[PDB]
């Protein structure tokens, strides 16, 4: 094990800790694949927890800066200031992949956003959030899994990483609110006649079943948009999508099949998910 292997198993270890579904898919890509998207997805997971470090925003200030540094000098030694680890890796696979540095900077301003949080007034702020925490880590990921990239290889990556995040949002619903977060707009709220604590207290009913799966219908929608257009990405990679695509759409029926609850985090076992590959692995 070399220093730089040490560096990506951590990324790894991120990774896997943070999503099961997520690695279980990417961590069939080939090596220097799915090493980079380890080193790409611990940043991105260590800019959306930096808030509670200390309480405020000193650690994410420094990964602002550290990837600043890569961004300018690529080839130069750093002396990083947040976690040295994920740095060295996202410099290392800056040294040999084109990374969308301001889709970083679009992620880590929605994160110091986050800070003042106020409820979305309508969908359009919701879904511009989902762009900002997701749609941004489709971005930096598009040169990884393709081998050729259009705005159309960008524009499906967005878009895919937009619907996991609002299946996560589904997922979530009652942790989130624990924790203060409401991700459901005022306007769909009020026009479901819906409130999130009420619901939490009481139990699900129709009206909440209703809006929820409105937005199940849109995260749908566009999982199925997604995997039309998925040959924009590389062949290895195609299967590897879908996986992880057809996972996080596992999840909507998990919810359905736990009554909607907001009191427990639902999950695909880890033998659906191989099921699920099986059937993906027959048609490629």
Request: hydrophobic content about 40%; proline content about 1%.
């Given at each position: ?75 130069e030694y750093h002396h990083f200031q947040s976690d040295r680890r994920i740095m060295m890796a996202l410099q ?191 048609k490629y």
């Amino acid at each position: 094990m070399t220093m730089m292997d040490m560096n990506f198993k951590y990324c790894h270890k991120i990774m896997k800790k943070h999503s099961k579904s997520f690695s279980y898919a990417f961590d069939l890509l080939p090596e220097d694949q799915r090493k980079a998207v380890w080193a790409i997805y611990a940043v991105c997971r260590k800019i959306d927890d930096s808030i509670d470090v200390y309480g405020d925003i000193q650690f994410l200030n420094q990964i602002k800066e550290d990837i600043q540094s890569i961004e300018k000098y690529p080839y130069e030694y750093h002396h990083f200031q947040s976690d040295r680890r994920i740095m060295m890796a996202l410099q290392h696979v800056a040294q040999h992949k084109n990374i969308a540095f301001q889709s970083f900077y679009n992620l880590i301003d929605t994160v110091y956003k986050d800070q003042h949080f106020t409820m979305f007034e309508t969908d359009a702020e919701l879904f511009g959030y989902c762009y900002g925490v997701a749609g941004t880590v489709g971005e930096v990921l598009t040169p990884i899994l393709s081998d050729h990239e259009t705005h159309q290889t960008y524009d499906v990556a967005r878009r895919l990483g937009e619907s996991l995040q609002l299946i996560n949002i589904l997922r979530d619903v009652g942790e989130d609110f624990e924790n203060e977060r409401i991700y459901f707009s005022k306007q769909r709220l009020k026009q479901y006649e819906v409130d999130i604590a009420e619901v939490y207290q009481n139990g699900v009913n129709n009206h909440y079943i209703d809006l929820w799966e409105y937005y199940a219908a849109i995260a749908e929608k566009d999982f199925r948009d997604v995997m039309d257009q998925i040959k924009v990405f590389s062949i290895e990679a195609q299967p590897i999508i879908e996986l992880a695509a057809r996972i996080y759409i596992e999840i909507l029926d998990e919810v359905r099949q736990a009554n909607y609850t907001l009191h427990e985090r639902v999950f695909v076992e880890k033998r659906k998910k191989a099921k699920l590959f099986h059937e993906i692995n027959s048609k490629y």
